[PDB]
A paper describes a structure:
The proteins in the human epidermal growth factor receptor (HER or ErbB) family are some of the most thoroughly studied receptor tyrosine kinases. Ligand-induced homo- or hetero-dimerization of HER proteins initiates a downstream phosphorylation signaling cascade, which stimulates cell growth, proliferation, and differentiation. HER2 is unique within the HER family in that it does not have known ligands and cannot assemble into ligand-dependent homodimers. Thus, to facilitate downstream signaling, it must either form heterodimers with other HER proteins once their specific ligands have bound or self-assemble into ligand-independent homodimer under the condition of overexpression.
Since Domain II of HER2 was presented in the unbent conformation, it dimerized with EGFR in an asymmetric manner, consistent with that of the NRG1β-bound HER2/HER3, EREG-bound human EGFR, and Spitz-bound Drosophila EGFR complexes. It is well known that different EGFR ligands induce distinct EGFR homodimer formations. Particularly, the high-affinity ligands EGF and TGFα stabilize the symmetric dimer, but the low-affinity ligand EREG generates the asymmetric one. Thus, to verify whether different EGFR ligands might also affect the architecture of the EGFR/HER2 dimer, we further analyzed a 4.5 Å cryo-EM structure of the EREG-bound EGFR/HER2 complex. This structure is almost identical to the EGF-bound EGFR/HER2 complex, with a root-mean-square deviation (RMSD) of 0.63 Å, implying that the asymmetric EGFR/HER2 heterodimer is a common structure resulting from various EGFR ligands. However, for EGF- or EREG-induced asymmetric EGFR/HER2 dimer assembly, only the unbent subunit of the HER2 DA is required, but the bent subunit of the EGFR DA is dispensable.
Author numbering:
A (entry chain B): 24 to 120, 134 to 599
B (entry chain C): 5 to 45
C (entry chain A): 27 to 594
Write the structure that this text describes.
């Protein structure tokens, strides 16, 4: 139920036909949004039924440029706003406007921690001005920015007469706001009614139902199992009896604004339990032999580290150019991402930005792991596949392109993928659009490449089936269960035979063939060539020449030499 | 007064017995302290 | 401010007579507020004064009031009982059996500021005359965690005590005068917060880490902290130095963060404790750890390889209940190098215990402790056989950290012995604690140690008196040493000068290491001449060896390999 949220500030979607499909795959089933609830560029006739269970959004909520009739955020409970769109804005509704947002219908939303409200240029909304935002905002930022749109160009009905105060969100009777700050008595933070008994616990942020500390509507600091308090319990409990240090068996991990049993994949755990995307200095990402990872401290030098996009050395630049091709020399585990913008192959005068060469892209042959995203949007006419990234094993995807995608291919002349050793895609999605030459998109086993239930393939505007049947675009029968990458016989992810040098073949040359190869459990490798070929029997067993029943020229106890 | 079980129990003290506590018990001297009168000042 | 009071560990035990225990109680608990040990008020007669008990604010252990005759024990300003030690494994406040033959014991006990006990329970029994304590409820004090094991009774037979004050609710008064009632903060309080409260208002209760009430919603206006203490405030855990940063995505310095040494938060760990990754001043690190300093201060890292054995010692871990090392636990310290605990050499080990069924200790088994090198806690030595004259069992004792001290003051306690020399030839540094030499018979050579250059921690003294006498070690058999520095000598044997004039080869010193009339030729290096390359031919009235290496000779012995002198 943990979805990371998109990162689309104001830009256009890459694929408008599957953008709503992307929101359906990523924002369905979420309850605590770790990132940003962003809904950008949605036209009419949009089934928005996936927004019926999102309650907690840790970032900013941005509903912009949408032509939908309404956005169903009635179950939205709290907007924390750890990250903000502008400097002091958290709930921004811009340029939505027949279509346009009729009513916001924010029923259970009563607490915004950090940020402000930006309602502007929306001539379809009625009640943007009659909402008391001081009741929702926190006391420390009561002097916030409350820019409210004025022009509406449509007169509508007044509020419902059943609830007083003239604080309504729409036209329905159950769609009016109950005050949680100004109706209280004394020094209560939040309260249910005007009575002093109906005040809430001091950790309850968005209200409560009872006076206990385990039944807030949405409490403030760190939730675990209902009982939430100021600080989450750490893994090591410091005792004051004999001044010893005991680990806590009941200590949870810190994950955003809540605490769970163990935080999921693509979150590196630390010693203090605060697992996040990247680890700080004097730390190395190691494997805890359980499928998860947990970075710890390292030695004194700790050199030989490779940095990528979104790190200390690379912040402003987005395209891989020749200015930073030296930094990716020989490193196997790139901390960061790799993005191939269309400006990476263009010649800009008076800027010392030389375009790349196809022979210069061979430095990524030893690359096996990318911690970020792979945004390839430009490719020359040298070779039609990704043989420069043929040894890429796992993509972590902790840093995503626009917060939603990890493997993005835009406008390429690619014909087959060629990603042989790709066995695990961590986070994000896969988007291939406006690529009319790539046919082998549905034959890839994308279900075995996933590690989360909220991951799916989004393919559109590609080469259809009719250009792949008459042209013979189909690989050999060696790839089992239709799991195929390219038309060559060396790109099967799981074949029924062995491997002669990362290549699925028909039969190992044991009983036949002029050289002889020994049978491995999964592979098929050649042993020493001076072993005597046995006509009609098992010739070679191991790589050392002593295990042959006969060799070619000279018989010695350690091995057989020609001289 | 204590029985013959507390002959080698007290280190530098005389054993006396309490009725309500009903436990083994020593009496330290001047310059002696502890539970069984084993620590110094 | 907040004078630390040590406390005692002598439960119910009478010290000497009644007057001797009264004078020891007056001497021990005078002018102290926070008691880390156990407030044990025992054996007080009728016509004595207990006015020194008013200044005690809080007790970390259990309060043990037993066998008293006085009509009033002024425990007025006793705020909070932490309860870090139990008596009957669940009890903290045990006022038990305070009576006389006239059934006149403790009549009144106005514990006015006592508002919360964190750990333990309350048991009251055997009180014939007792005013208004039977009306004090204890659901207000004891929480719902330890409510099951508590039990008490009150038998007021012919007490002849006056009426309680009806000016306070629920009839709960400690004494009988004005403002002498229980400041109850639990049952007349709102359930909108788990902490305490100062009034009946629902929005005017205390912080989560404020125990026994507070004087405001701000964490500074707070009486005591619950678990961890901050400087003039109360927090849950004071943060470490290097925190996160949302701007540069790197390590940022602390705005208010401090280290964690016990309950309070100090800025710097002392020089003998271990700094961990969580930013807490700890005594002992983890089990799969390796204690080794990196930059000045002592730290611990994760050990690699076998991770063989750590020595717990006496008082912590397995041997918490034991009181002395003996023949039973001597087999667990064979291949031991670092004593990460305490040691207790007592006369109970050298005489045999028929109660615990232990054999008498062989004095030849003290050579097992030659392998160890350091002691983190205190070294208590109170017994020694009457034949050996030196303490050479700790000859390889390098450093004494003093993390745990005997009664919080002394670390190296060599008292009541039969030695003529201390023999601590490798005692080069004592990080914490006082060294006492008292009650001995024939132990001089103690005022010429110059202990001020031994320890570096300020606020420490020394105490050496009444051992041998200044005129008793005047004879020729008892002299410090001749022709060596007067900084320190340990015994009459010439291997006991701390710093010598020329020659400091090993553990001993001589007149000079002969470069002219001697077969070993030793070059002087930092006033410690050591043996040079053995295949170097000695010269005649010349400097033979210059430094450590075969390339520091004029003429080789057998063969010449460049500048070096080799055998072949
Ligand atoms: C020599 O060294 C021995 C240790 O190596 C030491 O033996 C100890 O003797 C103590 C006195 O009886 C014991 O308290 C101590 O541990 C006990 O072990 C028992 C099992 O055999 C436990 O049942 C016992 O638990 C409870 O005991 C009493 C009951 O009232 C409580 O007071 C106590 O707090 C606890 O709740 C306890 O754990 C024992 N240690 C070992 C390891 O056996 C012996 O006394 C030494 N001889 C000397 C100094 O002369
Ligand atoms: C704090 O965490 C608890 C534990 O996850 C939350 O309780 C869950 O709430 C969801 C909401 O749809 C339910 O589907 C689950 O069944 C609940 N869990 C259990 C064990 O009942 C709780 O909502 C969180 N928030 C607050 C304010 O308490
Ligand atoms: C206890 O301290 C007070 C404080 O001045 C002092 O007057 C008194 O003599 C002390 N008691 C003893 C026994 O020293
Ligand atoms: C105290 O009560 C607990 C119940 O929580 C029980 O387990 C324990 O045995 C009791 N007695 C003690 C600690 O002596």
């Amino acid at each position: 139920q943990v979805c990371t949220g998109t990162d689309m500030k104001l830009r256009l979607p890459a694929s408008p036909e599957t953008h709503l499909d992307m929101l359906r795959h990523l924002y369905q089933g979420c309850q605590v949004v770790q990132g940003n609830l962003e809904l950008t560029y949605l036209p009419t006739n949009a089934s928005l039924s996936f927004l019926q269970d999102i309650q907690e959004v840790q970032g900013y909520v941005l509903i912009a440029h949408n032509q939908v009739r309404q956005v169903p955020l009635q179950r939205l409970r709290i907007v924390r706003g750890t990250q903000l769109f502008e400097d002091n804005y958290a709930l921004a509704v811009l340029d939505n406007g027949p279509g346009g947002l009729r009513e916001l219908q924010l029923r259970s939303l009563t607490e915004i921690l950090k940020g402000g409200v930006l309602i502007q240029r929306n001539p379809q909304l009625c009640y943007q001005d009659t909402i008391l935002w001081k009741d929702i905002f926190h006391k420390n930022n009561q002097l916030a920015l409350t820019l409210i749109d004025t022009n509406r160009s449509r007169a509508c009905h007044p509020c419902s007469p059943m609830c007083k105060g003239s604080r309504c969100w729409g036209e329905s009777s159950e769609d009016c706001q109950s005050l949680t700050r100004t109706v209280c008595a004394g020094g209560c933070a939040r309260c249910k009614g005007p009575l002093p008994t109906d005040c809430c616990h001091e950790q309850c942020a968005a209200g409560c139902t009872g006076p206990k500390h385990s039944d807030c509507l949405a409490c403030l600091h760190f939730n675990h199992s209902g009982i939430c308090e100021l600080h989450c319990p750490a893994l090591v409990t410091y005792n004051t009896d004999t001044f010893e240090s005991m680990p806590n068996p009941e200590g949870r991990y810190t994950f955003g604004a809540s605490c769970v049993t163990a935080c999921p994949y693509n979150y590196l755990s630390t010693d203090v339990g605060s697992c996040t995307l990247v680890c700080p200095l004097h730390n190395q990402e190691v494997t805890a032999e359980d499928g998860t990872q947990r970075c710890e401290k390292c030695s004194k030098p700790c050199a030989r580290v490779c940095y990528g996009l979104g790190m200390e050395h690379l912040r402003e630049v987005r395209a891989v150019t020749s200015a930073n091709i030296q930094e990716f020399a020989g490193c196997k585990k790139i901390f960061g991402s790799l993005a191939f913008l269309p400006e990476s192959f263009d010649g800009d005068p008076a800027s010392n930005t030389a375009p790349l060469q196809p022979e210069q892209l061979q430095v990524f042959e030893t690359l096996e792991e990318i911690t970020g995203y792979l945004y390839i949007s430009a490719w020359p006419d040298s070779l039609p596949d990704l043989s420069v990234f043929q040894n890429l094993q796992v993509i972590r995807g902790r840093i995503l392109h626009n917060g939603a995608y990890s493997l993005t291919l835009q406008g390429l002349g690619i014909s087959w993928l060629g990603l042989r050793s790709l066995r695990e895609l961590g986070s994000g999605l896969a988007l291939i659009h406006h690529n009319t030459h790539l046919c082998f998109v549905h034959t890839v086993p994308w279900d075995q490449l996933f590690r989360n239930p909220h991951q799916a393939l989004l393919h559109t505007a590609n080469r259809p089936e009719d250009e792949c049947v008459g042209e013979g675009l189909a690989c050999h029968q060696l790839c089992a269960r239709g799991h195929c990458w390219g038309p060559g016989p060396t790109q099967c992810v799981n074949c029924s035979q062995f491997l002669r040098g990362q290549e699925c073949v028909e039969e190992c040359r044991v009983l036949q063939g002029l050289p002889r190869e020994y049978v491995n459990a999964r592979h098929c490798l050649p042993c020493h060539p001076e072993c005597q070929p046995q006509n009609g029997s098992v010739t070679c067993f191991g790589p050392e020449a002593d295990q042959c029943v006969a060799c070619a020229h000279y018989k010695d106890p350690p091995f057989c030499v020609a001289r | 007064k204590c029985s013959s079980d507390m002959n080698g129990y007290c280190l530098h003290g005389q054993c006396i017995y309490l009725v309500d506590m009903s436990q083994n018990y020593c009496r330290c001297e001047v310059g002696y302290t502890g539970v069984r009168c084993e620590h110094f000042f | 401010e907040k004078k630390v009071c040590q406390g005692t560990s002598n439960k119910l035990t009478q010290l000497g007579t009644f007057e001797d225990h009264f004078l020891s109680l007056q001497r021990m608990f005078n002018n102290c507020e926070v008691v880390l040990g156990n407030l044990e008020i025992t054996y007080v007669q009728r016509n004595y004064d207990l006015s020194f008990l008013k200044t005690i604010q809080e007790v970390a252990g259990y309060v043990l009031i037993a066998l008293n005759t006085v009509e009033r024990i002024p425990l007025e300003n006793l705020q909070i009982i932490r309860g870090n030690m139990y008596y009957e494994n669940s009890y903290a406040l045990a006022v038990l059996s305070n009576y006389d033959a006239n059934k006149t014991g403790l009549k009144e006990l106005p514990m006015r500021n006592l508002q919360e006990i964190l750990h333990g329970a309350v048991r009251f029994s055997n009180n014939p005359a007792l005013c208004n304590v039977e009306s004090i409820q204890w659901r207000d004090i004891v929480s719902s965690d330890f409510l099951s094991n508590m039990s008490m009774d009150f038998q007021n037979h012919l007490g002849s005590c006056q009426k309680c004050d009806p000016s306070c609710p629920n009839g709960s008064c400690w004494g009988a005068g004005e403002e002498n009632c229980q400041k109850l903060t639990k049952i007349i309080c709102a359930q909108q917060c788990s902490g305490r409260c100062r009034g009946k208002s629902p929005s005017d209760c205390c912080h989560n880490q404020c125990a026994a009430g507070c004087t405001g919603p701000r964490e500074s206006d707070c009486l005591v902290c619950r678990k961890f203490r901050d400087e003039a405030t109360c927090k849950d855990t004071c943060p470490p130095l290097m925190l996160y940063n949302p701007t540069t995505y790197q390590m940022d310095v602390n705005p208010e963060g401090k280290y964690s040494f016990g309950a309070t938060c100090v800025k710097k760990c002392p020089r003998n404790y271990v700094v961990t990754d969580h930013g807490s001043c700890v005594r002992a690190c983890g089990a799969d750890s390796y204690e080794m300093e990196e930059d000045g201060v002592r730290k611990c890292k994760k050990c690699e390889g076998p991770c063989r054995k750590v020595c717990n010692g006496i008082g912590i871990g397995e041997f918490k209940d034991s009181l002395s090392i003996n023949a039973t636990n001597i087999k667990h310290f064979k291949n031991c190098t670092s004593i990460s605990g305490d040691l207790h050499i007592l006369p109970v080990a050298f005489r045999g215990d028929s109660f615990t069924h232990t054999p008498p200790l062989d004095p030849q088994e003290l050579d097992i402790l030659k392998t160890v090198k350091e002691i983190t806690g205190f070294l208590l030595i109170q017994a020694w056989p009457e034949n050996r004259t030196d303490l050479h069992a700790f000859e390889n004792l390098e450093i004494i950290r003093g993390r745990t001290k005997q009664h919080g003051q002394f670390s190296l306690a060599v008292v009541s012995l039969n030695i003529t020399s201390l023999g601590l030839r490798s005692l080069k540094e004592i990080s914490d604690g006082d060294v006492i030499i008292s009650g001995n018979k024939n132990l001089c050579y103690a005022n010429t140690i110059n202990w001020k250059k031994l320890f570096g921690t300020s606020g420490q003294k020394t105490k050496i008196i009444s051992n041998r006498g200044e005129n008793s070690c005047k004879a020729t058999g008892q002299v410090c040493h001749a022709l060596c520095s007067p900084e320190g000598c340990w015994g009459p044997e010439p291997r006991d000068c701390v710093s010598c004039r020329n020659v400091s080869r090993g553990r001993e010193c001589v007149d000079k290491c002969n470069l002219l009339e001697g077969e070993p030729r030793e070059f002087v290096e930092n006033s410690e001449c050591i043996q040079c390359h053995p295949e170097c031919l000695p010269q005649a009235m010349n400097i033979t060896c210059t430094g450590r290496g075969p390339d520091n000779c004029i003429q080789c012995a057998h063969y010449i390999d460049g500048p070096h002198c080799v055998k072949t």
